[PDB]
Design a protein around this ligand. Structure first.
Ligand SMILES: Nc1nc2c(ncn2[C@@H]2O[C@H](COP(=O)(O)OP(=O)(O)NP(=O)(O)O)[C@@H](O)[C@H]2O)c(=O)[nH]1
Ligand SMILES: [Mg+2]
Length: 176
């Protein structure tokens, strides 16, 4: 397809974060409204895509789902380039995935535009009894670094639509 032919804008997203935080399940819940209970480790980039409506216009999201597993991750961070948005994801039940955010963020901004809209996502909000990271901590990291923030559950679909749609609304407001 092409912008000005089969859609008004194409917004490229990348989804980054530690292994098991729920990147792939967020994507699948977004496009297919299905929850995948098994952890299938992503290795190369996997592409997802969906049409959305923003301000009455047809926008296509091209979504690059990436490997969290360090053993599978390339040292060449070339797949950042061209992304209008990034979904930066951690597991609210696993403190270490939150501690790695600084490095993911640095990685993201060193190989992408300062332009890029970054949505910080605390996923697995359905597992409240196992919470290790306060909602306030994710809120504060976002503010401190000029990100938007949302907690989601790929399992129950809570805020999943909003995570992807609000990212696009942010991009839209930025560029027009
Ligand atoms: N309870 C619950 N489990 C979730 C949620 N999101 C993902 N999971 C589970 O967590 C595991 C990891 O999901 P996955 O999306 O594969 O994570 P990933 O970030 O893509 N991992 P990788 O980087 O290795 O590809 C799966 O077993 C999945 O079912 C959620 O919101 N709630
Ligand atoms: Mg994955």
């Amino acid at each position: 397809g092409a912008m000005g032919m089969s859609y008004a804008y194409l917004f490229k997203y990348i989804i980054i974060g530690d292994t098991g935080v729920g990147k792939s399940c967020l994507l699948l819940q977004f496009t297919d409204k299905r929850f995948q209970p098994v952890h299938d480790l992503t290795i190369g980039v996997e592409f997802g895509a969906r049409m959305i409506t923003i301000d009455g216009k047809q926008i296509k999201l091209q979504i690059w789902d990436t490997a969290g597993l360090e053993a599978f991750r390339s040292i060449t961070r070339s797949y950042y380039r061209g992304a209008a948005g990034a979904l930066l994801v951690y597991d609210i039940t696993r403190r270490e995935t939150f501690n790695h955010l600084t490095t993911w963020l640095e990685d993201a901004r060193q190989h992408s535009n300062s332009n890029m809209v970054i949505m910080l996502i605390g996923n697995k909000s359905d597992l409240d009894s196992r919470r290790e990271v306060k909602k306030e901590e994710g809120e504060a990291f976002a503010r401190e670094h000029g990100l938007v923030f949302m907690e989601t559950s790929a399992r129950t679909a809570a805020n999943v639509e909003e995570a992807f749609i609000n990212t696009a609304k942010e991009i839209y407001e930025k560029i027009q």
